[PDB]
Amino acid sequence: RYRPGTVALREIRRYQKSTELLIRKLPFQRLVREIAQDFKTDLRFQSSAVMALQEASEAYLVGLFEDTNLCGIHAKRVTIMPKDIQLARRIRGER
Amino acid sequence: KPHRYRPGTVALREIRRYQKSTELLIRKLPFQRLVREIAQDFKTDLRFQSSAVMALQEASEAYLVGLFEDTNLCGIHAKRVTIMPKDIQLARRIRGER
Amino acid sequence: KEDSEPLGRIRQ
Amino acid sequence: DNIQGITKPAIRRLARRGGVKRISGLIYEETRGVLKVFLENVIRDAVTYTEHAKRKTVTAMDVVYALKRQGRTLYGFGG
Amino acid sequence: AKRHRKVLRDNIQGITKPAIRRLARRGGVKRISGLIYEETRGVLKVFLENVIRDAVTYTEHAKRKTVTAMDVVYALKRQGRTLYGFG
Amino acid sequence: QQLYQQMLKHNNNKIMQLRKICNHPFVFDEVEGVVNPSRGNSDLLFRVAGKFELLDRVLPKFKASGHRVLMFFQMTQVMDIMEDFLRMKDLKYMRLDGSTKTEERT
Amino acid sequence: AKAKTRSSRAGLQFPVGRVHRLLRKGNYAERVGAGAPVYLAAVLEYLTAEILELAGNAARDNKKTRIIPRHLQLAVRNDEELNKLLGRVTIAQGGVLPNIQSVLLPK
Amino acid sequence: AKAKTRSSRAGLQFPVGRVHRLLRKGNYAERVGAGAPVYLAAVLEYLTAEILELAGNAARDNKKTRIIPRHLQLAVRNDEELNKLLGRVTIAQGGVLPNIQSVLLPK
Amino acid sequence: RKESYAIYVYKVLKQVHPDTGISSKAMSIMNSFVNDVFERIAGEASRLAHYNKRSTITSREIQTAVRLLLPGELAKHAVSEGTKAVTKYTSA
Amino acid sequence: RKESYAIYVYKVLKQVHPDTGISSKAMSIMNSFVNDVFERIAGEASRLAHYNKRSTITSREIQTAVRLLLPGELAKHAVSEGTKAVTKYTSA
DNA sequence: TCGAGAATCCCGGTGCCGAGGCCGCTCAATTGGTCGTAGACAGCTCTAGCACCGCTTAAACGCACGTACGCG
DNA sequence: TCAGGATGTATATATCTGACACGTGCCTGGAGACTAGGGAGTAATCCCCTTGGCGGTTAAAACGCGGGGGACAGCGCGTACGTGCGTTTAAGCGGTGCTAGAGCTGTCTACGACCAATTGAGCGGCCTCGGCACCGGGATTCTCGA
């Protein structure tokens, strides 16, 4: 076994090093279509349209986590909490 | 002994007072000198309309007040009521100003 | 004139 | 529920790329909420462009335009 | 002093400790650490440098020497800080 | 001579600064520091400004002659340097201007 | 040859004719459809009405009879939806809304 | 009637002629000055070249002989001014810069 | 001459709160407000038409631009209002 | 047919790192990069013409637009390069 | 738990100067014709997008345990 | 603090492919030559607004100074999170099969630019008065203590 956090750091290195998408594509697609249903039915998507949505979405969330992390460590904690996400959004003005 | 309010009572009064009112908080002539000096570093012998300066100050104070709002929030997040440079720096870093 | 060497800087 | 289609480990991975070391369990649900909102905004704009053009297929360009509208210019998908 | 005034301090020092305090009060700050005052001045200086630089660039472009309110407005508008009330 | 020539060429200072240095170089604080870093009551205070060597030609014999003198100025160091000139030469004097209050005016 | 303004034809208070000219002066497109400035002027009026309505209400609440910058600020910031619209706008002399965090208040 | 392109006249690698047309087709103004598209094309080239240089450097660091999106990301994110220029830009397949906070790292 | 919307804003005010007046400072704010909105809508309509390779801005583009500019119900009402106004206009 | 800057980007690459090639994804990114910059500069130049009540975009407007777009040294060098290009262009 | 000094709110008189209205003046918005052409529309094509399933397998999940960091 | 070991990472070697570099034919979009006209440059006036300094008051900034309240370091508790293992399940990747809609081309016309003739809507100038600022004063509450 490893001391908790050792592997976490390995994973951080691993994911920052690589560049592929992190969210399962088909689950993502279904999410998109579901949301789209509320604006207009019978819509289609180019496969590249979904790809654009996914990658932009992941880029967004990664950036969010970066800022969230900063808030957590501002409070001298290493565990991020919902209130750190909320803070980050509030500071950015996304609220 | 003479009357003294518990520290923070006055602070809250000031907060209410300044949020209620709308006038400028920075002395105008000091503000102008600051502006003029900065301007000299881009081009000398510039003139300013007096309203140009006012535009700068309205924006400047709006900016700093907004900054303090966010700064305050950060301090609160960290369980403090005293704002610190760390909170200012964080706020700007989160906003993406640095 | 004399000390033009430092005066050459103050003029800046 | 498709929002739950974004799994716990998927979120963890995102957080790892973001440099997050330790993650509270509450984060996973909170993150889903945030993403949902993000997509609703982008998709709404993209759909609007599609409707405007009288088409039925949302194109990549419509997505790109939506992102440009929101100040999140995306390179590589044309535009 | 009497013999020589020696009163040249700095233009950034024109933003006084209480001036900053007042801004913070409007912001809603209850208590302010002593290092804030210096940090605030630094931030403001930067803010003005960016706005002024844009404003004078517009002025230079127009071949004028007087920076107008509209030039300031355009500078602010450029940076995503639209200011109402100055035309 | 050099301040005039240099500022003449450097460039409302074309009227004002040239007046200031004609009045006395050290009214500009930085040149005071450059010419005399100690900022003390040195003889350079006279050497750098023709108008006061004239006063060295006048105020000594003038006082010796039993006479009194009034004189009018531009503000700031233009007057404050006189206080120094007068103290260097032990020429007792008074000084009155807009910054003084009605009590001592009287 | 009785003249009648385009705004009166539309039933609007904004100068449809002026709007039309502005669209052509700003080079927004090669051509401007006849109904484009009509539609637009109506929207401009609508939004104008929304702010003034709220601003007037603010004046009433402050026992004033004229709208001042402060009222405009209060009107916009209280109305969340308008607040979103003008989220990046600074209003000269508007000030800020009264707001003290509960954490800062005494027991 | 010897022909010579404006790009070759200016000594640029970008299609000055195309740029000129784009300025006119995009309705940026009523008239487009003869020296406009030339000046602009030069700028476009300048910026393009600087990024490609840095991207190539990134490729060399990774022992690659072909620029991929990751390299472009590394190039832009590392250079201060390019980072500012493209501060609001998401580059597809770029990823993020290697960066672990020292507070998370072991002592 | 320096045209503005002061008179139109003024008229609108009198149709909403007939007794309420408005300071000249507030008026200049409202003036710049109108200009801001005008630009935003026109700007979006401009590039919107451009996106479809069209050279003419019509009420369709203005409408869409409104939907792409104003938030929530505000947009819904603006669209409703614009639609109505045009309807009447073309009738008259 | 659909035009792009692919071949121009490519030539530039060859002029900087002769040996280095470029993936199609990287190329599409560079293509959208060029379009982005083009638009930002052109957009600013456009409103500069409007701000001065003019109607012609010349190298002066573009130069200013560059100064109002690029940060620090990028601006300094871009302006320098633009100047040289025009200079040579009109000289010969 | 009731008093004491200080901040605040309300009322009334003053008064003044910026908003509201009137009026002459012009130039920009109408009206009325022309005229080239951008867009509407019909029609035809054909391909990409959607729906479903078969099959493999790598990830997701559930459980359980230690312990480290959150928190008081 | 140090050696062993398990895991993981890294590194040389085939090998294999599909994605990039490159050659070729076409065609339309860019260059050349030429003409008009109006936008921009440029000179001359003028006058309003900016700037530099001083005079004089006074609210405010600075400064010292006591002292209490918050920041923060330490320390214990316990619970929520990481880590690992076995099990499930749903994603990824290959098929079929249908057709809706994107896209292209050809008409054809309502419709917006263009131009001139006309006039009142809006704008600058200039009265005019009450809405709101401002002070005098007295009731009222708001934050301390014995």
XYZ file of N, CA, C and O (backbone and C1' of nucleotides) in Angstrom, chain A residues 3 24 33 44-47 76-79 81, chain K residues 48-51 59-60 65 67-71:
132
model
N 1.055 5.574 1.209
C 0.464 6.542 2.099
C -0.485 7.413 1.292
O -0.073 7.939 0.257
N -16.498 10.367 -20.172
C -17.045 9.380 -21.096
C -17.966 10.038 -22.113
O -18.968 10.655 -21.748
N -27.934 16.272 -25.246
C -29.213 16.191 -25.907
C -30.339 16.443 -24.943
O -31.293 17.134 -25.285
N -30.684 18.120 -34.050
C -29.628 17.188 -34.343
C -28.319 17.825 -33.999
O -28.257 19.027 -33.770
N -27.274 17.035 -33.932
C -25.972 17.607 -33.676
C -24.930 17.056 -34.583
O -24.910 15.860 -34.856
N -24.016 17.904 -35.000
C -22.889 17.386 -35.724
C -22.046 16.704 -34.686
O -22.045 17.119 -33.528
N -21.322 15.671 -35.058
C -20.519 15.017 -34.053
C -19.450 15.955 -33.541
O -19.108 15.921 -32.361
N -6.265 27.295 4.291
C -5.331 26.355 4.898
C -5.838 24.938 4.931
O -5.519 24.184 5.844
N -6.612 24.564 3.937
C -7.099 23.209 3.837
C -6.633 22.610 2.534
O -6.330 23.340 1.596
N -6.556 21.294 2.449
C -6.164 20.717 1.177
C -7.320 19.976 0.566
O -7.219 19.481 -0.553
N -8.423 19.906 1.291
C -9.607 19.255 0.787
C -10.529 20.298 0.209
O -10.960 21.192 0.929
N -13.920 22.004 -0.890
C -15.304 21.863 -0.459
C -16.216 22.706 -1.322
O -15.743 23.633 -1.964
P -21.079 13.271 -45.524
O -21.318 13.637 -43.991
C -22.149 14.731 -43.659
C -23.273 14.320 -42.725
C -22.846 13.634 -41.433
O -23.655 14.110 -40.401
C -24.443 12.343 -42.486
P -23.166 14.056 -38.880
O -24.421 14.625 -38.093
C -25.623 14.850 -38.790
C -26.722 13.956 -38.267
C -26.424 13.269 -36.940
O -27.584 13.271 -36.157
C -27.039 11.678 -38.524
P -27.515 13.044 -34.573
O -28.681 12.007 -34.321
C -29.904 12.194 -34.990
C -30.645 10.888 -35.127
C -30.587 10.005 -33.893
O -31.863 9.535 -33.583
C -29.928 8.787 -35.791
P -32.250 9.269 -32.052
O -32.673 7.739 -32.039
C -33.595 7.264 -32.997
C -33.353 5.802 -33.264
C -32.917 5.015 -32.033
O -33.958 4.167 -31.599
C -31.676 4.427 -34.000
P -9.421 1.909 -18.246
O -10.604 2.631 -17.469
C -11.626 3.236 -18.216
C -12.974 3.079 -17.544
C -13.099 3.713 -16.171
O -14.346 4.312 -16.108
C -13.781 1.491 -16.053
P -14.621 5.543 -15.131
O -16.018 5.152 -14.485
C -16.531 3.870 -14.738
C -17.829 3.640 -14.014
C -18.002 4.426 -12.745
O -19.374 4.426 -12.413
C -17.457 2.177 -12.241
P -13.812 -4.307 7.822
O -12.437 -3.520 7.958
C -11.315 -3.952 7.216
C -10.243 -2.882 7.167
C -9.994 -2.149 8.477
O -8.614 -1.981 8.648
C -10.467 -0.593 6.782
P -3.077 3.070 9.999
O -2.718 4.399 9.207
C -3.551 4.802 8.126
C -3.891 6.268 8.237
C -3.391 6.928 9.515
O -3.068 8.278 9.257
C -5.690 7.186 9.380
P -1.648 8.723 8.647
O -2.083 9.758 7.510
C -3.452 9.782 7.115
C -3.926 11.147 6.646
C -3.103 12.335 7.044
O -3.603 13.420 6.310
C -4.995 12.184 8.436
P -2.746 14.743 6.035
O -3.879 15.855 5.909
C -5.046 15.559 5.166
C -6.304 16.005 5.889
C -6.337 17.465 6.312
O -7.606 17.974 6.053
C -6.847 16.117 8.135
P -7.809 19.524 5.717
O -9.303 19.778 6.177
C -10.260 18.762 6.007
C -11.375 18.878 7.027
C -11.698 20.286 7.501
O -13.097 20.417 7.674
C -11.007 18.957 9.340
P -13.740 21.837 8.051
O -13.900 21.762 9.622
C -14.441 20.606 10.216
C -14.410 20.716 11.727
C -14.517 22.138 12.267
O -15.373 22.140 13.371
C -12.635 21.095 13.172
